[PDB]
Amino acid sequence: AESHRLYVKGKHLSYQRSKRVNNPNVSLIKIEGVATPQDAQFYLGKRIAYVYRASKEVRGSKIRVMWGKVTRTHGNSGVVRATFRNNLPAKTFGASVRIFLYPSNI
Amino acid sequence: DSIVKASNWRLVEVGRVVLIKKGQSAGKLAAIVEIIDQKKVLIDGPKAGVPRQAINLGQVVLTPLTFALPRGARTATVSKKWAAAAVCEKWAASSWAKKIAQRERRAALTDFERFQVMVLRKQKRYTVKKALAK
């Protein structure tokens, strides 16, 4: 097979925040091909992973992954809030994230 | 001789076939029955079961098809004219309706159906690439 992707690509925009106060515990994730809350409803509960290359060796690879979950929709343009065990470093604004299909409901 | 380009605009008129894009009756055909103002026009689509109600021109897109219809025609007369004019037959022949049907079929395609489509596309290409270059 040409493509081995089994996840929907997405972009990390920024944390939920006010004008002067931000909440790093809640991240906002944009899903490719999603522009309405109804479309984003299908992605609720799916595991979201962030993939980045590391400089130092790890327990059997060179890639480190931070896992998360989708919690609720955000805004009207299909934005969805995501939560992770470890919050993103805030340096991934505009980075690419992987939205897996499991757990499935189809 | 004199030259004038087509410039043919789809004019709003009684009996004009119109396809609704927004609202509960989205995707269904209708016919204009009367004109109220520059923005709102009365339509009827009894063939598709849409209720007779006023609709803004921004909520609907005019189709090139047209048929004769008296101004202010009621539901019965509108349905009679729609049946007589064979509006449904004309709509299916238009490439727009064919594209809509193709899009619906593609949306409804199953994964196994998608695999079959891929295999058939490969088979067709095997001959298409051989038809050319010689």
Binding site: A1, E2, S3, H4, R5, L6, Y7, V8, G33, V34, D39, F42, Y43, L101, I106 | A107, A108, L109, T110, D111, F112, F115, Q116, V119
Partner: protein, 69 residues
């Protein structure tokens, strides 16, 4: 898409069967028996063997919330 699995005897398999306590010979025999019964039904329709041999993967523009699986 659903195949007629009625012809496959699945009573032998249980939770304790998969207990992990070089592959056990009994497991290989059961797998062969299941495959022999299932292949006959799988081949009963076109492209089923090829379809199952193809690994599923996503493509650009694919919308899982729209794809009808």
């Amino acid at each position: 898409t659903k195949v007629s699995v009625e012809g496959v005897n699945v009573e032998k398999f249980n939770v304790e069967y998969f207990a992990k306590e070089e592959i056990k010979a009994e497991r290989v025999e059961d797998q062969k028996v299941v495959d022999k019964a299932l292949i006959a039904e799988i081949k009963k329709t076109p492209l089923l063997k090829q379809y199952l041999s193809a690994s599923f993967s996503l493509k650009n523009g694919d919308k899982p919330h729209m794809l009808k699986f």
